[PDB]
Amino acid sequence: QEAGSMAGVLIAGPPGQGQAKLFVGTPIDGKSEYFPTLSSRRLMANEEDADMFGFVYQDEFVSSQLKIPSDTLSKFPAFDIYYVYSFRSEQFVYYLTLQLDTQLTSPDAAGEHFFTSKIVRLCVDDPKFYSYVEFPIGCEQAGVEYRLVQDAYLSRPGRALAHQLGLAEDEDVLFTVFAQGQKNRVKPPKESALCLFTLRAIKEKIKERIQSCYRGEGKLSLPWLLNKELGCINSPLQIDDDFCGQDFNQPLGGTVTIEGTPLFVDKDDGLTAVAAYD
Amino acid sequence: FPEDDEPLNTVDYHYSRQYPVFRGHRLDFQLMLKIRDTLYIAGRDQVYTVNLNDIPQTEVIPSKKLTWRSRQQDRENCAMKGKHKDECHNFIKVFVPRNDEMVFVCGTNAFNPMCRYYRLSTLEYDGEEISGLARCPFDARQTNVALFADGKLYSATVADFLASDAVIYRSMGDGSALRTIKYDSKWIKEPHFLHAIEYGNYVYFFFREIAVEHNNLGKAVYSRVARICKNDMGGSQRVLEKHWTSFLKARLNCSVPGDSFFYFDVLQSITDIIQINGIPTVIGVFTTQLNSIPGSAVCAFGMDDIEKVFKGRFKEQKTPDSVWTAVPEDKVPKPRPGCCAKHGLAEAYKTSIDFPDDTLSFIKSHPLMDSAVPPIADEPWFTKTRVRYRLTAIEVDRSAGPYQNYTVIFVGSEAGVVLKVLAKTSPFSLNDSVLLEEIEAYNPAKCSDRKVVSLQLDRDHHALYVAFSSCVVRIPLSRCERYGSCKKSCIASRDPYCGWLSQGVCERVEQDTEYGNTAHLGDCH
Amino acid sequence: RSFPEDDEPLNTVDYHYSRQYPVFRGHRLDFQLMLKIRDTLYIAGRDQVYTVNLNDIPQTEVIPSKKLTWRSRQQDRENCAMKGKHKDECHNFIKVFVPRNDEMVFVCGTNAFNPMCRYYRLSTLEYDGEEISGLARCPFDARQTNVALFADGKLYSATVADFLASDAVIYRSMGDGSALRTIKYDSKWIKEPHFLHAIEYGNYVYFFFREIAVEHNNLGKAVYSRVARICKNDMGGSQRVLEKHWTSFLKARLNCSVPGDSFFYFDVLQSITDIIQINGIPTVIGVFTTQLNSIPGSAVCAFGMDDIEKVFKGRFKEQKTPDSVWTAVPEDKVPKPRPGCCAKHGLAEAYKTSIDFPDDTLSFIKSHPLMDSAVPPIADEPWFTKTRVRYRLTAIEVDRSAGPYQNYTVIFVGSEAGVVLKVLAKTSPFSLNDSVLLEEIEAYNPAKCSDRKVVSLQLDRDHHALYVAFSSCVVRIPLSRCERYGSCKKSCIASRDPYCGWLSQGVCERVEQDTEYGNTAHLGDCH
Ligand SMILES: *[C@@H]1O[C@H](CO)[C@@H](O[C@@H]2O[C@H](CO)[C@@H](O)[C@H](O)[C@H]2NC(C)=O)[C@H](O)[C@H]1NC(C)=O
Ligand SMILES: *[C@@H]1O[C@H](CO)[C@@H](O[C@@H]2O[C@H](CO)[C@@H](O)[C@H](O)[C@H]2NC(C)=O)[C@H](O)[C@H]1NC(C)=O
Numbered sequence A: 001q002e003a004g005s006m007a008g009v010l011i012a013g014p015p016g017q018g019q020a021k022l023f024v025g026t027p028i029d030g031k032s033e034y035f036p037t038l039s040s041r042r043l044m045a046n047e048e049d050a051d052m053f054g055f056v057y058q059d060e061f062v063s064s065q066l067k068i069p070s071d072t073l074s075k076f077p078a079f080d081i082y083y084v085y086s087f088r089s090e091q092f093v094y095y096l097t098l099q100l101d102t103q104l105t106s107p108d109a110a111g112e113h114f115f116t117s118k119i120v121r122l123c124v125d126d127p128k129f130y131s132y133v134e135f136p137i138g139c140e141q142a143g144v145e146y147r148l149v150q151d152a153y154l155s156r157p158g159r160a161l162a163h164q165l166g167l168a169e170d171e172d173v174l175f176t177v178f179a180q181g182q183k184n185r186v187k188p189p190k191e192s193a194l195c196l197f198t199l200r201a202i203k204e205k206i207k208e209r210i211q212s213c214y215r216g217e218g219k220l221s222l223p224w225l226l227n228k229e230l231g232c233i234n235s236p237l238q239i240d241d242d243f244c245g246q247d248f249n250q251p252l253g254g255t256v257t258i259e260g261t262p263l264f265v266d267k268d269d270g271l272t273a274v275a276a277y278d
Numbered sequence B: 001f002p003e004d005d006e007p008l009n010t011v012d013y014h015y016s017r018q019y020p021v022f023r024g025h026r027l028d029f030q031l032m033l034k035i036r037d038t039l040y041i042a043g044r045d046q047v048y049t050v051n052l053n054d055i056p057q058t059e060v061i062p063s064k065k066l067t068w069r070s071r072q073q074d075r076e077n078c079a080m081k082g083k084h085k086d087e088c089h090n091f092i093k094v095f096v097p098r099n100d101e102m103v104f105v106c107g108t109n110a111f112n113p114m115c116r117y118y119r120l121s122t123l124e125y126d127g128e129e130i131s132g133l134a135r136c137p138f139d140a141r142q143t144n145v146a147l148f149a150d151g152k153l154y155s156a157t158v159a160d161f162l163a164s165d166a167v168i169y170r171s172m173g174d175g176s177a178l179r180t181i182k183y184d185s186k187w188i189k190e191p192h193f194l195h196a197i198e199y200g201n202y203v204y205f206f207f208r209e210i211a212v213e214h215n216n217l218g219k220a221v222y223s224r225v226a227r228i229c230k231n232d233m234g235g236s237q238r239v240l241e242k243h244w245t246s247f248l249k250a251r252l253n254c255s256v257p258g259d260s261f262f263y264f265d266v267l268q269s270i271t272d273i274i275q276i277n278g279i280p281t282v283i284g285v286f287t288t289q290l291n292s293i294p295g296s297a298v299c300a301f302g303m304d305d306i307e308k309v310f311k312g313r314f315k316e317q318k319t320p321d322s323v324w325t326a327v328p329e330d331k332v333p334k335p336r337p338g339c340c341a342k343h344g345l346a347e348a349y350k351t352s353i354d355f356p357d358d359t360l361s362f363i364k365s366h367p368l369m370d371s372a373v374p375p376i377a378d379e380p381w382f383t384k385t386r387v388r389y390r391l392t393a394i395e396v397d398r399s400a401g402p403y404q405n406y407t408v409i410f411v412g413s414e415a416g417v418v419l420k421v422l423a424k425t426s427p428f429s430l431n432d433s434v435l436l437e438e439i440e441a442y443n444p445a446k447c448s449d450r451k452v453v454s455l456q457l458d459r460d461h462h463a464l465y466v467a468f469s470s471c472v473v474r475i476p477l478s479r480c481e482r483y484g485s486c487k488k489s490c491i492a493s494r495d496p497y498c499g500w501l502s503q504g505v506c507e508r509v510e511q512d513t514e515y516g517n518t519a520h521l522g523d524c525h
Numbered sequence C: 001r002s003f004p005e006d007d008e009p010l011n012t013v014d015y016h017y018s019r020q021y022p023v024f025r026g027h028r029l030d031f032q033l034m035l036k037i038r039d040t041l042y043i044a045g046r047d048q049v050y051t052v053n054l055n056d057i058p059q060t061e062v063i064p065s066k067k068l069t070w071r072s073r074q075q076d077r078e079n080c081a082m083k084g085k086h087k088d089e090c091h092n093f094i095k096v097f098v099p100r101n102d103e104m105v106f107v108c109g110t111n112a113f114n115p116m117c118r119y120y121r122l123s124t125l126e127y128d129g130e131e132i133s134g135l136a137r138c139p140f141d142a143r144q145t146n147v148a149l150f151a152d153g154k155l156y157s158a159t160v161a162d163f164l165a166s167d168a169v170i171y172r173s174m175g176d177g178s179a180l181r182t183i184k185y186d187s188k189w190i191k192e193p194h195f196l197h198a199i200e201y202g203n204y205v206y207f208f209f210r211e212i213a214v215e216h217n218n219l220g221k222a223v224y225s226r227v228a229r230i231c232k233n234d235m236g237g238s239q240r241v242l243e244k245h246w247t248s249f250l251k252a253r254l255n256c257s258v259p260g261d262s263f264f265y266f267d268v269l270q271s272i273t274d275i276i277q278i279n280g281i282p283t284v285i286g287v288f289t290t291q292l293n294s295i296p297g298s299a300v301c302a303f304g305m306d307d308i309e310k311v312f313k314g315r316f317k318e319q320k321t322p323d324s325v326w327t328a329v330p331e332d333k334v335p336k337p338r339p340g341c342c343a344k345h346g347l348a349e350a351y352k353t354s355i356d357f358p359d360d361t362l363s364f365i366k367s368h369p370l371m372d373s374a375v376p377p378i379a380d381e382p383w384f385t386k387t388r389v390r391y392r393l394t395a396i397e398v399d400r401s402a403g404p405y406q407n408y409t410v411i412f413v414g415s416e417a418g419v420v421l422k423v424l425a426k427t428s429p430f431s432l433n434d435s436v437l438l439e440e441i442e443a444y445n446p447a448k449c450s451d452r453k454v455v456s457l458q459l460d461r462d463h464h465a466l467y468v469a470f471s472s473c474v475v476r477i478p479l480s481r482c483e484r485y486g487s488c489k490k491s492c493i494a495s496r497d498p499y500c501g502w503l504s505q506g507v508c509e510r511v512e513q514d515t516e517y518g519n520t521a522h523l524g525d526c527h
């Protein structure tokens, strides 16, 4: 019944043809059998058609879908993914989600559940949903924690902040707003910050954790999506920047929270929305 | 608590290398099936035939051969996936004949499982390839089951290269693709499947898994018996869409009595339905947990006692931190969950999609019965506990003995030893089970890890083909010559396959296998 | 990381090799316990307690120096026959022998299932004084175990109280106070236990036993290893809750496990040691097996006093519903003061006696007498195991300072089948790689003794000997056997026996050596 927990973008395919894929993420309130928490459904020019909102790849085993495991809801009852922002960048689509922490929260649903903000990224050209990847995000300034994501806007920084960061004129930037802490979410505390993440530094820390996996170090770490502590399998494959996953080493877990550059803090009258341009 | 039996006769290495072995680069044995008077051996890249009428010479020489190696790009995708070259080979893991001409074959295909149809007459690849997903394992080292009943194929394996989703999957029929709930730890959590059997309206399954009733301690392994309706078509749109609606499972009770009942809960292998003393039984081989004191037992159940459990009371966990307890008789929703549509307590239902939401959503969160299945005659039939090695392969001859009223069980081992045991089944049969022979059956020269994998009874040639990981050894059922002239040694062995003749030699089939009296018998040296 | 295997004995000693050892017998000997003071070993059996001078080197048989004679009276014998116990049982089996001071010894017998206690002088084993009632101080049956010990003038017993053998109790009496006891027939405090040992430490007395557990109730009827605790100064509860009953009675569980994916617990305790200084920290060392109806396995785990003490300041354990799983008592629900803390110490220091405890705290420890936490071992895995064999380990005894430099621990354990294992134990990270089973000896003497079950042991360091007790005979067994290797330089040092050493004279004598590794580097085969 809440709004604002759903987000997505439309991506019309090659012109002339009536299809437009549409990547949508939403919470499901534990009804994992009925509704996927994240899918890649299809669009058609004739609105009455029954193939509307149908997954762009479907078979009995993996689909352009992503159901919450019936296991994870049993280990902790009202777990859910709220989907704040989503933006198209390069040949991918990113989401900024906020999930219930599988760690800092005991299975007991007393009401002390903590949360963890995370970016997520897929490929537009990933029908089986192999390219999935998920890193926590946040920032700090003067030892004040800000880890409750609130809003985000993808903007081209124009010419000033570009040369300030060493980015080319076509590279984009994401401004963000984080609330203090990891507690409560339904009514976060006022203290909020406007932090900055470079699209570069995110594509880097990705090619860095998925290059670190295809070498066999560590393991994929998504305690809610994977359950069994699978290890990072070794592999003689050379990762690009535009590597869209394969049937192993996915969905891939983020180990170190990407830190952002703080630009502004307000400790009295809380921040809510954000946008930018040049 | 009992004690290890003493083998009446020991066959050591010197007395056993006089037995033929099969080979054909190595072999890497996987499974074996007996059809008519032919035995089929499936391994890496190869499937071999041995004609059971040809008395073997130094070696067992294969007659016909089937070959099905993994494709080239499959051999290189496997390398990119990080798996080693020795593993990237086509290990045949499924071999079930559909009719009396054609045989369903599946291979690992270097962690890219596919399935095919071969003809028995020729072993030729005829037709086109089918996908082996959810049907054949990715790893060769994993366990799996595969069976055909009434048109449709009942598989049971892992479905993904990463080895997370274990599923029971019916397809290859006129109906749809039904399956188990992925990741649902209450239904199945990290299992190793071992067998399956059709009986009545149900396909009964046998496997091991981590137990959820002994979670308030270590990661124990409990031996389970599950069942499914044959005519299940899945659930309605709300509950159990495309999923089984007939999934009940029970626990197996392999108990040494006493003040602290001692349980064996790791299932190693089991047989098909065998008529023992008039009633259909299944005979299985149980060990203890890995991080425990090595111990092994053979428990036997009956189809009756399996069925009785499932009409009994269901098991529920009232609250997260409470003990698994019974479901009230009033809370069992109508119709009887597990019962098959058009039969018994649900005959007012045309299909399994007609079932109420409360009956469906009950079996999805109480798939585990309460009761445990009793083993016939309380304690196990045989135990061997003091020794360093664990038990494995089982095989049974229901009609052993000159009168065919004696149950002789043949069991494998880890350290290449095989035990032949005359089992005490009924009360009026013996005082207890007696360990007839201990045969070391591993041939150091012709073979290499010496693990017996399975066995297959060749009752028509008085033999048993013991299977190892790289060799297969043809072992006669009786070394009656080891005794020969010595009538003392002979009938004192109580082996029903041997005996004493009036010609004055110990041969095969006058004997006394029941008590075994040493009366009126002299003393050879 | 997985499951241990049976260590291979570096040297074995068969019956022929140990019939060359002096023995002790006597009318059948019915040994129960021994004790060493100074240079004298008191041995208690049927009707009799013998003394043996330990300076006297035995020739062919250990002969007794003095002895103490005390048989059951005629009336006691007929009542014991009238009660319907066999005449072989209606004797006076000595079961308690505990010096109070340096002259007197508190001596109790079974007295044909009518327990009586007396005082004797030590020097002369002379009945000086009068009879004290032995009730709930000495058992009725000589097959039952019992614990007895004096501490600050008060006698701390542990046994069964009735002929019918149903009232397992822990008792204090004969003091300057009066008579505290556990609750009779209370399947919560203690349920059909077999008591093994007790020790006095700090403000409390700790007990070690085995009993029917209550956390393992969902499967079968199984026995766990417990460690209990009572205050020395405990005076009893008020007139409403625990009047004349213990108030500081806390018990916890002993975790003797093998780590893995599926932990394997040895839960049945067979014997234990007194407090021993093992490498800096005070230690106790226990011998643990598996259940009766089980595949015989035996283990020796060792715990620390710091680790026991911790579990009692830790959380309590409760069971919410009778059909719910045992649970941790919440911190904010413990009353005040801290139940099980002794009056006038730490937390009850605003309390003069234990009769001043609140009804909040008295009724809590009356129904929550078991701790939640278990006592872990040191090194978190047993110090030695024995599984693949058909017997069980019984008696335990240690040498806290073995070797030329005395920085190595050796442990001596008995067995049912009349075998005794000598283990050099690993006690610290920097020691050996694992604990190495040195010698395995068959001490039992079939021709001279008789079921051959070894009962208790006792180290006699000064004479380099371990006396080894059975039910029908006691055997005097020299520790080392350096003579068995003689001149074979290899054998002497690769046996790694810290007692044995290699000398310039070219022979293996007691106390040059290398017990650390045992390099048979530069050494040749002896024939
Ligand atoms: C496993 O099997 C044993 C063997 O029968 C069961 O033990 C008996 O259970 C009945 C049930 O009323 C008792 O009356 C008997 O007294 C038990 N046997 C003995 C020797 O006491 C045991 O209950 C079974 N356990 C499970 C979980 O099924
Ligand atoms: C298995 O069959 C044998 C042979 O019929 C049984 O042993 C015979 O029993 C008959 C009648 O019961 C006797 O007259 C013979 O003297 C027996 N012969 C021998 C060699 O023992 C045996 O009892 C049967 N066992 C069972 C369990 O039915």
Ligand SMILES: *[C@@H]1O[C@H](CO)[C@@H](O[C@@H]2O[C@H](CO)[C@@H](O)[C@H](O)[C@H]2NC(C)=O)[C@H](O)[C@H]1NC(C)=O
Binding pocket: C255, C257, C259, C260, C373, C374, C375, C376, C377, C380, C381
């Ligand atoms: C018995 O002792 C073992 C040995 O330490 C315990 O195993 C550890 O348990 C703790 C918490 O219980 C874990 O954090 C460690 O990871 C365990 N260690 C290993 C090596 O696995 C065991 O839990 C103890 N059990 C009881 C009931 O006290």
Ligand SMILES: *[C@@H]1O[C@H](CO)[C@@H](O[C@@H]2O[C@H](CO)[C@@H](O)[C@H](O)[C@H]2NC(C)=O)[C@H](O)[C@H]1NC(C)=O
Binding pocket: C405, C407, C430, C431, C513, C514, C515, C516
């Ligand atoms: C126990 O004491 C022995 C003897 O003092 C120690 O072993 C010797 O240590 C010295 C000094 O490091 C070495 O030079 C010798 O080579 C060692 N000889 C032998 C026979 O061990 C030993 O290190 C001590 N152990 C501990 C744990 O302190």
